[PDB]
Structures are given as C-alpha cells and as structure tokens.
Ligand binder design. Structure first.
Ligand code: HEM
Ligand code: HEM
Ligand code: HEM
Ligand code: HEM
Lengths: 105, 51, 49, 60, 111, 378, 75, 48, 378, 51
C-alpha cells in the first residue's frame, strides 16, 4: 500500500483513504467479491486466519454502522500486509484451473 | 471463454446435436407458417391455396 | 485460565440519571422509560389524529 | 411528579397497555378540536380577505 | 416466550393451586434446609449474618403461613414487571434476540 | 408453541417481514423500496378511489375531468396530487436504479431482470396509464406515441392500426389503453411478490458488500422503524409538493383540452418519461431509436453480463465512482438535453450523450472496470 | 434460507450489551456531528463534484450557446 | 381549480407542525431503538 | 441435480402441481376446481378482452353495448357467451358446495371460511360486476338492490346514499360498481392462491375418507390428464350453451334498454343469483331477510361448527344422505319457489322452505347427525 | 362444553381478566367515539362542542 500502491493500491491506500478499504484497515484479500471459487476458497481457509478475518470483518461492519473509522494511526499499516489467501486462493486458482484443466481435457 | 465449450470434445457434442438441431429448428419455422399463414410464405402453398 | 475478561465504560453514551454508582435506578427507570414512552405515545396519539 | 408523569403516568397511565391507549384517544379529542381551533386562528390572522365580508357585505 | 411469557403468564395467570403446591415445596425443602446438620449449621451462620435473627420455624412458617396470592399478582408486578434481569446461554447464542427483541420480549404485547 | 412460529400464513409472514433475519450493516439505500409499494398501494388506492369517481369516457374526457376536477373537491387534491405522486414513484424509480448501480448489486440476476420487467413495464404501464387523461399534451402527443405504434417493416401500418385500433388513435384507444392501465398495475403487483420471494431466497446484498451472515437483525425493530421513518419522509415529499404547489411540475398543455386539429409546438414526455424522448429523437432511424430505448435497460442487463471487477462495491473503486456520478451526469444531462426543443447545439449535444451512454456505460464504464482491475494488483 | 442456527461458524469471540433506556439520545449531538459530518461529506466532495461542475458549465454554457443563437443580425 | 388554495392551504399549516413534531419524535424513536446497537462492545479475544 | 427438484420458483411449482403427492383414491369431485379457475381465468380473459372494447359509459350503456354487441362480432359470441360462462361458474359453484357437503369435507376450517369469503365475495362480486350491463332488468332491479343499500337503522338513508352515491342509483353507481367489478376479481385471485397454499399445507381429504398416506400419486399423469379431460368437458359445456343456443338462459328484460320510468313486472335475479331473491322476499322484515342471507353460507360455517358424526363420509351414513339430496330438494325447491312471482301457494311454500333450510340443515341435518350417531352403536 | 372452561379455576381466570376486560372495552368504545364523532354521542360532548 505504498506510493505507487499508495496512488494505485492507493486507490486502496491513499484513495482508499478515499475509497476506504485499507484506511478502514480492511483485509486486502477480504475485498474479493464473493464467488463460488471464492466460496470454497474460504472453506479451505486457515483457522487462526479465519478468526482474524472474522474480527476484521465484523469490526468493519461496526464502524460502518458507526459511520466512523479507526484512528488514522489505527488506519492500517501500509504495505506490510500478508497476502492471506493468495497462496491459498491462488492455489485454488490452479485448482479451478485444474478441474478447469482436465475439464478442458 | 468459448474455449470452455470449445474443444474436440464439445465440438463432438455439437456434431451430435446438429441433426436434431435442424429438426427442432424446422419445428419452429413451420410453426410460424401454420400459425401465421402469413401471406408472404402463404403464396407458395399449393392446394393449401385458400382461394 | 478462563476467567480474566472485563467490560468497557458506558459513560460517553450514558444519559445523566445513571451517572452514579451511588444510587438505584429503582427511582430512575420508571422515569426513563417514562420519557421514552411519552415520546412514543406522542407519535401514537398524534398519528391517530 | 414528572417522575410520576414518566412513572405514574407510566404507572397510573402508560403502564397498563389499554390505559396507554385510552389515554391516546383521550388526547385524540382534545388535540383534534384544539389544533382545529388554533389552526383556524392562524389562517384567521393570515388574511381577513373573505367571510369577514358579510359585515362588509352588509350581512343582510 | 416460555420464560418471560411464563413470567408474563406468571405476572397474570395466578391460580392458588400452584401457590399451595410450591408452598408445600418450600415446606419440604423447608425441612431439607432445616433438616440436615450442616445445612442447619450454615443456615444459622448466614441466618444471623444477614438477619442477626433466625426466622423461627413458625416465623418463617408465619410469613410463609401468611403467603398471599394477591401479592402474587400484584407483588409479582411490583418486582417482576417490565424489567431486564439476567439471561446467559453458553455457546452459539443466535437464538438470543436483541435487547431490542429479547428485551423487547422483556415487554408484553400479550397485552 | 409460538404462533409467530406456528401459524402457516404467518409462517410466511414472519419469514417475510417479521422473523426475517437481515444484514445488520443495512443502509439507507433501502427506504425507497417500501415507499414504492406504499406508493404503488397508494397508487392503486388513489387510482381506485380515483377510478371510483373518474370516468374515462370520450365526451367525458375533460368533461368528467372537470367533474373529476372542477367538480371534484380533493379530486383536486387526490387527483392532481397523487398524479404527481406517480412522478414521485418514478423519482425513487430512477433513484433506485442508482441504488443497484453504485451498489453494483447486479450480482442477483433474476432480481435484476425482474426489475427490468418492472422497468419497461413501469414505463409503458405509465404511458398508456398516464395518457388516460387524454389531454392536449397527451393528445397531440397521443398522435405521437400513436405514431410510435407503426415502426416495423410491413407491420406497423397494420400494427399501429391494431394498436391504434385503426386509422388513427381513437376512442378505440381510449377504451384500449384505459383498460390496459386498469390491468397492468396488478401485473406489477404479482411481479412484485415474485421478485420478493426471489429476494428472500438468496437473501440479498449489503452496502458493506461482505457476507452478511456475520451480522443480522429482523427489520423490527430496526429496518422496520427505519421504514416507518422513510415513510414519513415520503408523506413529506408527496404531501409536500402536493400540499404546497400542486401544479409546479405540470406542463400547461395538459389543462389544454385536446383539440384534434391543434398539434402545438411542444410535444414532451413527463419528468418521469423525460429522458427518453430526447433519446428517441436523437438518432435518425426507427429501430435505432427503439433498440436504443429498450437497449438502455437492456443495456443494464448487459451490464450485469458486463460485470467485471473482482470487488462488488464501487465504494472501494473511486475511479469507478467517477464513472458513476459521471454517468449520472450523462443522465440528467440527457434530461436537460431533452430540456430543449430541437436546437443547433443540442443536436451535437445529445448526439454525444448517446456515445457516453454507450461509452460511459457500455465502454467507458466497462473499460473503467478493466482499468480498476489492472490497478488493483491484488 | 438463513433464519438462524444453521447460520455460520463463530469461534472465540465475545460481546457486550446495554439496555436502551440507559443512554442519552444525542451525546455530543451537535459536537459529534462535526467534521465527522464533514468527514463523510467533505471526504467525498472531491470525488463528487467534477461532473456537476461540467453540468453548470453546460446548462449555463449551451444555455448561452443556443440562447445567443436565437439572436438576429443585420444584412 | 384551487379554491382549497385557501382550504388546502390551511391543512398545509398543520403539516408543517406534524412533521416538525413527528419527524423529531419519529427520528427519536428510531434512535430510541437503535441506540444500544450504536455503542456495542464486542470482543475479539482469540484464546492464546 | 434435477432442476425439477432444484429451481426455487419451480420448487414451488413441483411442490404445487407437479411433484405434488396426492391421494390416489381421488374422485371426480375434483374437476370443478380447475374449471372454476380456468373459468376465472377465461372470466378475466374474456372480461379483459371484453373490457378491451367495452365501455362502461352512461350514454354508452346500451349504446356501447351495441358497439359491444350490435357492432361487435363475436362480441356477440364472446359477450353473450362468456356472460353465460359466468353462470356456469356459478353452476360449478353451487355444485362444488355440494362437493364439500356430501363430502362433508368441512373438516378443514380455514379452507371452509376461505371459500366463504369466496362465497359472499363471488355473490356481490358478480352482482355489482354483473349489473354492469345496466340493463332494464338490471336497471329497475338496480333500483332493487339499490334499495337493498338502505337497510340499517339510522344509516341506510345516508348509507344507500353513500353506496348509491346519493339520492338514488346513478351514473355515480355506474362508475362505482363498474370499478368495483374491475377490482374484485383480482381479490378472488389472491384469495385463491391463499386458500390454495392453505390446502397444500394439510394436504386435504379423500372421497374414501381414510388417511390418504396409504395411497398417493402426482396429479401428473393421473389427476393431471383427468383434469385435461374435465376441461374438454367444460368447453363442451360453455362452448355448447354458448355455441348452440346462446340466449337460452336469458331474461328478455336485459335486452330491454334501461327505461328509468319503466319498473316492469318481473324483477328476478340470475339463475346464479336466483335462490336468494326468493329467500329475500320470503320474510317480512329487513334484517331477517339479510341475516338470513349471510346466514345461509354463515349457516354453513355453523355447519362445520355443527359437525357432529363420528364418521366423515355420509357415504356410510344413508339417512344422512337422505338429508343430503333432501336438502338439495329444499334447494332447487327454493329455486322454483323463486321461480314464481309472488303467489298465494308460494307464500306458504317458501315460508316452509325456510324452516327446512333451518331444519333440513340447522335442525334436521344436525338432528339427523345425532340420530345416525345413536344408530351407530360402534 | 362450556364445562371445559367452566370451573373455579377458569372462573378465577375470568376474575383476573375482568378489570382489563373493562379496559380494552373502553378502548373500543371511545375509539368509536373519536373516530365517528357520531352526532348521537357527539351532542353530549362539552367544549368538544364544535359549534
Ligand atoms: C390500479 C391502480 C391504479 C388505478 C385504478 C389507476 C387509475 C387512474 C385513473 C382513472 C387516472 C385518470 C384520472 C386522473 O388523471 O386523475 C390515472 C392517472 C394516472 N395515474 Fe394511475 N392508476 C393506478 C395505478 C397507477 C400506477 C401504478 C401508476 C404509476 C406510478 C399510476 C400513474 C398515473 C399517471 C401517470 C396518471 C396520469 C397523470 C395524472 O394524474 O394526471 N397510476 N390513473
Ligand atoms: C416495482 C419497483 C420495485 C420494488 C417494489 C422493489 C422492492 C424491493 C424491496 C422491498 C427490496 C428490499 C431491499 C432494498 O430495498 O434494498 C429491494 C432490493 C433490490 N431490488 Fe428492487 N424493487 C423494485 C424495482 C427494482 C428495480 C428497478 C431493480 C433493478 C432493475 C431492482 C433490483 C433490486 C435489487 C438488486 C435489490 C437488492 C438490493 C440490495 O440488497 O442491495 N428492484 N427491492
Ligand atoms: C373461487 C372458487 C374456488 C376455487 C377456484 C377453488 C379451487 C379448488 C381447487 C383447485 C381444489 C383442488 C381439489 C379439488 O378440486 O377437489 C379445491 C378443493 C376444495 N375446495 Fe375449493 N375452490 C373454490 C370454491 C370453494 C368453495 C365454494 C368451497 C366450499 C365452501 C371450497 C372448499 C374446498 C374444499 C373443502 C376442497 C377440498 C376437496 C377435497 O379434497 O375433497 N372451495 N378447490
Ligand atoms: C376482472 C375480470 C373481469 C372483467 C374485466 C369484467 C368486466 C365486465 C364488463 C365490462 C361487463 C359488461 C359488458 C358485458 O356485459 O358484456 C361484464 C359483464 C359480466 N361479467 Fe364480468 N368482469 C370480469 C370478471 C368476471 C367475473 C369474475 C365474473 C363472475 C363469473 C363475471 C360475470 C359477469 C357478469 C355476470 C356480467 C354481466 C352479464 C352479461 O354478460 O351481460 N365477470 N364484465
């Protein structure tokens, strides 16, 4: 979430200071629109992770209703964000690429 | 994403459905005919000639 | 191992009447739900008209 | 007082559900005719452009 | 709906029968505290601790004897009605409605 | 047990409004919906009561209209009023469309296409329904859309006959559409409960955009009371424009009695029907105009098909939002465009506005989507 | 489908609640409204305006364009 | 057309009040409901 | 999986018609039901198409009627025809009532009261709907039921005003009822799906009378095809009386234009509306007459409350059956009773017929029930 | 089958509901009043006198 990505992923950082996500402290991965692949993707998610994304999500709802945001300090640390799913997810990308693959076969 | 159904497999699938496809198509067409009896086609109809 | 939790402060949201650990809402409640109930009935009686 | 308004008028009024309602309509009267009246007053001070006309119409 | 409603049921529905029943409950039980050596023991302990007195057998059996189901309807209303006492499940509580529901349930539209 | 749980019709009910679990994060995007139905209900309601007096007879047109107006006390009010209220329904209509849009709610197909039925349905259902007044505006204009009935190769002549009832618009129409109105509202209704159950199926989306199972409450109290609020807001709206300056939105050509020989200068659609007729006159060909027309909403269907981004909420997609309010700019833009009679600047103006509609949606909005994706990098 | 109890999985979290009559309806009402209010609004403004700008520029603009275009000249 | 431009005018007056009364009363009631939800404290305290 | 199983709207569908498990023992008692709806549909259908041309305007009454008749080709046919078809709907209506009766199906309350709504609903819904022709029969007769609007103490005057629109029946009414018709059919419809789901809930009874879980199939093919059959039977019925002697059932007073001064000798209700007006004129008091009226069906509600026997099927209860067809005798009896104008013998005749209705149902049928019980000995 | 709810038990039940019963009844009645403002009763209404 840093200057190129604070301009660009600073649509998610400076301009999600504007578009909100990361300054809202969101989870990058969490932003993926729910899809089936996304669905079972999460089904396979890691546990401690699952809790984490949970608290994140709920909180997001919380301030959302509150229509407030955390301290800009509390606003999320830029860059410095594990790509949570992306190993798991992207793995699934290969999966549905595989079901998709022999499927093509 | 036509590649999804694009493959010699689904290609073969089409090769199967083809003649049937002709069939149901004909069904629709003739239906338009008798239903409509639209003059445009109706003309060519001998002894189905109504006058 | 399990017992250590705790709870937060309502003050910022707290209406005045409850400010004190000193006193019983034994008084307050009927007054509070009173005020609200009043407001509500205002909305019922007016709406009736 | 106001504590018996909030309270007794909960208790001796808003407490019993029915009582709350009977109270409600009981108002519906007073409010109705009243606002009717003062409202009429508003329009009254508004103009005096007609129906005061009768005296001017010389109210035969 | 059971509980509060029963409470609601309670707050309304009194029939002397049960009153007498749980009277006999507190009678039997009444032994079962009085009955027993340590139960009587600690019973003395908090008895003066709180009380400083001991509700005598016929004193506790007196206010007990005095039991009044009018005060059931009324006194019930006095303490019970329109309040927010404790409820705690343990576990996935989703059937816990809101205070705006569960404790809307704290109020009775049965009337 | 709990009859709320128990009673079967109720079992629907609680399942419908009452017991309904719903996203807690829920946003004001809501209100309009019940409004519309309330509107709709009132719509019917008034129309009904309106129907109760009103006659829709050829000699009676302005005639009964007077009887329904000049005679009719509060036929004044109810009439002109809830007439405006129609337009209000349109207001929340286009609004609501926006709701899905910046929502991007397009995720749910049967809902989308549903409200598409709601769309063209609302459109003509009005138009016919609307025209019923048969007023000079709606009259020469009746020659207008009446001339819309003729479009097709080989058909329209015979068609705009069959539509028109014959050689022109006529009392033929008068009955015809008059009924058509009488019917269509019902259609809207059943359509409604339809799309509704469809909704209850999936549940539905959230302004947040996250899976809602995290947080839900029943509409009661929350969405319920909130709804009551927005309703009062409505009576403010309707009961306002009505209550204060009823005629404000009107076009005098209405009160103008239909004068068959008239054909005056204006010929415009309603603030409701507005943005169309511009779009109509925009192109120089028949089915260009129409296919465009149905291609605006139909276009929106494609937009669900055109859905692109890896994230639902444009909230996180600012450049998208630029395309959003920007697209709106193209929209009310299209309004004020129609807001002029045929004019030199306007020609080019709308001429480009269409491209926008095709770009700002079909291209520039989708192109935008792709772009934002590229930027996303996650 | 939904309702509850088949709903979803939540492990190792916690809550806190309060009775309604407790609070005050409008803590810091005016106060809190604030550049909090301007925080949402003002936050959005830049994102919002430009199209509307073009608008006023337009209806104004073309308003002049055709408006003047309605004027008659000599010869 | 609008003789009630007088009569109906009258009603509008009461409207001005009703909302001003209700609108607040309504909004209040809404807050009256939603208030608790506003301030909620929910704890993420994952064990260990 | 199987979309038949899968598709949610279908999930209703299969659950409704298709996948629907149903008592195998099922009996011809059925058919009428779909008929009615088909009827109803056609009803609407025709009415709609009918509406399409027809105008319901004061000067237009017989006028448009001619335009809707004398002009109208197959407006002849559709008009007079499906007009008769209405009566057919009544036919299966009273029939169907019988169906439950010898069925004794009264076991299911919400259904029963439902169809009671269907009952009075059908009744006036017709009557107003019916009267729409505003024909001399329906005209002076309009002065009739118009004079029905006045019954109450202190009210009717003001009421039959409000009902009547004022000092009499008027064009006021014309609009009024005219709409009222336009509305009520819809009401019937939603009412229908209502009672329907109510049915699907319990399932329902069987001519056998035993618990059906022993034997069930889906309507397809069985009840399905069977239904198709009975439909053809209908088109035989309707398309017959229509197709052959359209006017056969008519009363010439209809084609008589309304002549406000007329008031001719007859004043009768439809073969549909028939059995009433006898019942009406029967008693010498206002609310006697009415409370009787609503007390016929209402009486039937009591009959469910009056349900007595330890066995459902009167099939096993012959003496009961005697009361059944016997009661019918009282019924069409009441018809031919109405089948005379006010007459010396008739006076006593119907005078007793009522007692029957009160006995043959309320007493003699219930008394019968008790008796059969006594005999039962098991 | 009134004996079902006829017993000193349900009797007592009634004894309970009675005052409330009066209450809701009053609710209905007054409702008819204000709703209707029916002249028949309306007359007796002082200062609710509208003329
Ligand atoms: C089935 C319920 C409805 C009935 C019975 C009904 C009947 C009528 C009638 C008789 C008129 C002519 C009298 C007049 O103009 O005041 C009319 C006008 C109109 N109503 Fe409806 N309609 C109904 C539902 C709707 C709906 C759903 C809409 C769409 C929001 C709608 C919008 C209109 C419009 C645009 C007009 C003409 C404009 C005007 O008021 O002058 N009404 N309606
Ligand atoms: C007859 C007019 C309509 C009515 C009465 C209607 C009714 C409703 C209701 C009651 C909701 C509940 C939740 C909410 O409002 O957000 C809703 C949501 C929705 N409607 Fe409509 N609607 C109508 C027209 C439309 C249109 C025109 C569309 C789009 C073509 C549409 C697509 C949706 C979608 C996608 C949602 C889901 C919203 C979300 O969860 O964010 N409906 N509607
Ligand atoms: C609007 C007219 C009505 C319609 C469209 C309607 C529709 C139906 C349909 C589709 C069925 C399916 C099974 C069958 O026909 O046996 C049915 C059965 C039934 N209906 Fe109706 N009905 C109507 C009027 C009535 C009336 C007037 C009653 C009696 C007051 C009635 C009470 C019943 C009962 C009790 C059954 C169960 C029959 C059995 O299983 O033996 N309905 N109806
Ligand atoms: C909502 C759909 C319906 C519409 C639009 C409709 C409209 C009309 C209109 C305009 C007439 C007068 C024209 C004429 O008499 O030919 C009429 C006659 C009538 N229709 Fe309907 N009606 C509808 C449903 C019904 C229903 C449910 C019934 C009851 C079976 C019904 C039975 C009648 C009767 C008895 C008459 C008068 C007798 C006659 O045909 O001369 N119609 N209707």
């Amino acid at each position: 979430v840093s200057a190129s990505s604070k301009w660009l992923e600073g649509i998610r950082k400076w301009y999600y200071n504007a578009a909100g996500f990361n300054k809202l402290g969101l989870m990058r991965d969490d932003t993926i629109h729910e899809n089936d692949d996304v669905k079972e993707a999460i089904r396979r998610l890691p546990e401690n992770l699952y809790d984490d994304r949970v608290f994140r999500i709920k909180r997001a709802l919380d301030l959302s209703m509150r229509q407030q945001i955390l301290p800009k300090e509390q606003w999320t640390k830029y860059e410095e964000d594990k790509f949570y799913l992306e190993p798991y997810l992207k793995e699934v990308i290969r999966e549905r690429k595989e079901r998709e693959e022999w499927a093509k076969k | 994403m036509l590649t999804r159904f694009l493959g010699p497999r689904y290609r073969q699938l089409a090769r199967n459905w083809v003649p049937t496809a002709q069939l149901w198509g004909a069904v629709g067409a003739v239906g338009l005919v008798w239903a409509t009896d639209w003059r445009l086609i109706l003309d060519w109809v001998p002894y189905i000639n109504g006058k | 191992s399990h017992t250590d939790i705790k709870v937060p402060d309502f003050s910022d949201y707290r209406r005045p009447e409850v400010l004190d650990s000193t006193k019983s809402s034994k008084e307050s409640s009927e007054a509070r739900k009173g005020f609200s109930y009043l407001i509500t009935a205002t909305t019922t009686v007016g709406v009736a008209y | 007082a106001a504590p018996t308004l909030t309270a007794r008028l909960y208790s001796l009024l808003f407490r019993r559900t029915s009582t709350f309602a009977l109270t409600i309509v009981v108002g519906a009267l007073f409010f109705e005719r009243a606002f009717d009246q003062g409202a009429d007053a508003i329009y009254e001070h508004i103009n005096e452009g007609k129906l005061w006309k009768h005296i001017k119409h010389k109210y035969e | 709906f059971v509980l509060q409603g029963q409470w609601m049921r309670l707050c309304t529905s009194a029939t002397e029968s049960e009153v007498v029943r749980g009277k006999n409950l507190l009678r039997n039980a009444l032994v079962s505290h009085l009955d027993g050596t340590t139960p009587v023991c600690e019973d003395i302990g908090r008895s003066l601790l709180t009380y400083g007195r001991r509700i005598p057998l016929a004193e506790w059996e007196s206010r007990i004897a005095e039991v009044d189901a009018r005060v059931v309807r009324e006194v019930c209303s006095k303490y019970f009605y329109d309040q927010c006492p404790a409820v705690a499940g343990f576990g996935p509580i989703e059937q816990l409605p809101d205070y705006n529901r569960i404790r809307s349930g704290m109020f009775w539209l049965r009337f | 047990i709990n009859i709320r749980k128990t009673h079967p019709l109720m079992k629907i009910v609680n399942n419908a409004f009452i017991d309904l679990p719903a996203p807690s994060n829920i946003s004001s995007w809501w209100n309009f919906g019940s409004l519309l139905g309330i509107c709709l209900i009132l719509q019917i309601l008034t129309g009904l009561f309106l129907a109760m007096h009103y006659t829709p007879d050829t000699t009676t047109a302005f005639s009964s209209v007077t009887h329904i107006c000049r005679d009719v006390n509060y036929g004044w009010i109810i009439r002109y009023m809830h007439a405006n209220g129609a337009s209000m329904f349109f207001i929340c209509l286009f609004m609501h469309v926006g709701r899905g849009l910046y929502y991007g709610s397009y995720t749910f197909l049967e809902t989308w296409n549903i409200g598409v039925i709601l769309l063209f349905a609302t459109m003509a259902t009005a138009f016919m329904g609307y025209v019923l007044p048969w007023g000079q505006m709606s009259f020469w204009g009746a020659t207008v859309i009446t001339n819309l009935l003729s479009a097709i190769p080989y058909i329209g002549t015979n068609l705009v006959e069959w539509i028109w009832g014959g050689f022109s618009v006529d009392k033929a129409t008068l009955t015809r559409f008059f009924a058509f109105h009488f019917i269509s509202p019902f259609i809207i209704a059943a359509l409604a409960m339809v799309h509704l159950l469809f909704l209850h199926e999936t549940g539905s989306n959230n302004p947040t955009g996250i899976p809602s199972d995290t947080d839900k409450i029943p509409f009661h109290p929350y969405y319920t009371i909130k709804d009551i609020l927005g309703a009062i807001l409505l009576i403010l709206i309707l009961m306002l424009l009505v209550l204060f300056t009823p005629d404000l939105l009107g076009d005098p050509d209405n009160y103008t009695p239909a004068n068959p020989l008239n054909t005056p200068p204006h010929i415009k659609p309603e603030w409701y029907f507005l943005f169309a007729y511009a779009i109509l006159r925009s192109i120089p060909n028949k089915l260009g105009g129409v296919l465009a027309l149905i291609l605006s909403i139909l276009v929106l269907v494609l937009m669900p098909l055109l859905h692109t981004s890896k994230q639902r909420s444009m909230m996180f997609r600012p450049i998208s939002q630029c395309m959003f309010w920007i697209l709106v700019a193209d929209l009310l833009t299209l309004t004020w465009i129609g807001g002029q009679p045929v004019e030199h600047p306007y020609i080019i103006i709308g001429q480009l506005a269409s491209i926008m509609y095709i770009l700002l949606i079909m291209v520039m909005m989708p192109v935008a989507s792709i772009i934002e994706n590229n930027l996303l990098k996650w | 489908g939904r309702q509850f109890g088949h709903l979803t999985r939540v492990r190792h979290v916690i809550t806190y609640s309060l009775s309604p009559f407790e609070q005050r309806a409008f803590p810091h009402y005016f106060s809190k409204g604030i550049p909090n209010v301007l925080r949402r609004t003002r936050a959005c403004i830049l994102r919002v305006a430009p199209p509307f700008v073009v608008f006023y520029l337009v209806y104004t603009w073309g308003t002049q364009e055709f408006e003047k275009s309605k004027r008659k000249n000599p010869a | 057309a609008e003789p009630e431009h007088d009569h109906r005018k009258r009603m509008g007056l009461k409207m001005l009040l009703m909302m001003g009364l209700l609108l607040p009363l309504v909004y209040a009631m809404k807050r009256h409901k939603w208030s608790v939800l506003k301030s909620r404290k929910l704890a993420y305290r994952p064990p260990k």
